[PDB]
Design a binder for this molecule. Sequence first.
Ligand SMILES: Nc1ncnc2c1ncn2[C@@H]1O[C@H](COP(=O)(O)OP(=O)(O)O)[C@@H](O)[C@H]1O
Lengths: 300, 303
Amino acid sequence: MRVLLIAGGVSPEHEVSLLSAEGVLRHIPFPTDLAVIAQDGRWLLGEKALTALEAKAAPEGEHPFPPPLSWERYDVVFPLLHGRFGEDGTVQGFLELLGKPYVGAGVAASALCMDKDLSKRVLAQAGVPVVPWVAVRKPVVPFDPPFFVKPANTGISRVERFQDLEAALALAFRYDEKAVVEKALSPVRELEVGVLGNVFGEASPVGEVRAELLIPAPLDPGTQETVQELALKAYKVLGVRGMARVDFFLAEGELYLNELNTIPGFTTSMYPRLFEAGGVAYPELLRRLVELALTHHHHH
Amino acid sequence: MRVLLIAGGVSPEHEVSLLSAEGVLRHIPFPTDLAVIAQDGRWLLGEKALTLEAKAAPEGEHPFPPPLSWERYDVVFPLLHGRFGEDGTVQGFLELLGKPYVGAGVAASALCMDKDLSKRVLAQAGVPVVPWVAVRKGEPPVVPFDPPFFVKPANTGSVGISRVERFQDLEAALALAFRYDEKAVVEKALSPVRELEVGVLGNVFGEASPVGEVRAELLIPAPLDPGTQETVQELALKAYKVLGVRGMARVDFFLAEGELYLNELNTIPGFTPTSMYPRLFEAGGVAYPELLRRLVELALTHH
Ligand SMILES: Nc1ncnc2c1ncn2[C@@H]1O[C@H](COP(=O)(O)OP(=O)(O)O)[C@@H](O)[C@H]1O
């Protein structure tokens, strides 16, 4: 049993990815080798991957894709990547062709959960409350300001004026060919809940961000059970595997599902702390993640 | 300009993928080398891949990823049908190679390949689809409509499909579908029904070909009321836009009792001499070589 942990990436969250790698490595209860995708896309292996991990950044790598690895020595791959190339199904699809088990959601769920237009389309069709939004490709917005203008696939510029719209599109178009424009909520409470499992997952306690984490979140009992049920329902509809951190918005008790993150930060990070308060310690959480990937691959 | 054409695959459409290659190799206006994915998963290159001349490759030489000289090509043309072809897996590998490639990207490929997730996207956008429910292995089915149904694996793309005419034969159909995918769909089987198909060309903002029809004869163009054929192209271009498809797609519709229903989108359709997609754009004024050149060009344009 040996795990291949991939960290870094080409997305702007490259440095956050290496922060989660140091967390996973120190606790994961399996022999684990580290792979680092540098910011130029070239891979770093062996001692050079651990050195760049201590540097919290890999500006340039050595090995072009595909890297010189014997995939037959790794039983499970852990794509600990965030954003483009890592969370949107590309890395997932390559590991599928490779016949390799891997932690996290599949190709379809990764691409969908990383798309803020299409995921909202599926969630809304399933009856899940989401923020009113429109999709703008590289502009008709039916609701009045303020908006939140975001690129469709990322892991953002507040707009209070209609004349301030075509400028927020260019900042969002810097990261994508498509953007979303959704109605701003203020004031808003942000709720987050971790899910663990393949399709039919179990929920952690609900937490709240305010950078301060409230675990558990100060919620009336029916509201947090609604959060847990909305998370498990969206999780199952989207066919998410392994894990996901589902984020919500809360006005009064008007809950809106914000987004699903298939590769949550994995340092103190919210997702491990949520299942820590739910009786799943960080090593046991990583152990079940590796076993959920083997259970899906070799038994489904 | 040198293009690599990947054909074959591990899916039941392995033979038809090789036929589509011979059609693309018939008149692509570029020098093009052929790489074949055999049915066992290993790849054949060089003249052994061409030795395509046998119409079936049971065994291959190189395990994935193959020792292929990707730097010697300007575009990749994945001509694989079904799983490990149209489902984003190959494209994700090409995305990580940095090679521009023909066809839809990872997002649209996997989504159009999923018979359940695509219909949810399409129905929310206001595009008509047939009544359907998803059935996940382990939880019992809940079908609000009455037979006859179609029962298919959600993301497999022809094995595992059943026509269920008795509500009690549903459990056997789900057992068969759950042999190939953890999720199935139960679609209402329309009858009588006509099969209408139309091609789309372009990057997200595409152009529609004349509508076709399968009666097996291909009616090009299809004999449709002037309003219905305009609605087909309108629904085709819209679904093509919402899903963010790049390159090409063959959009299959059902026509029952005056109502249109989008059946599915095909991101890597057939390219055989019999196939519907190239003929539909020939009738539309786009030659077979001009189609492949623009497909190659659109791959470089998005890149
Ligand atoms: N409609 C909205 N109303 C109020 N606050 C919002 C809205 N959309 C985003 N935000 C704020 O901005 C942040 C945007 O994060 P999110 O939309 O989840 O993008 P990412 O996927 O990059 O996290 C949220 O955490 C929230 O605090």
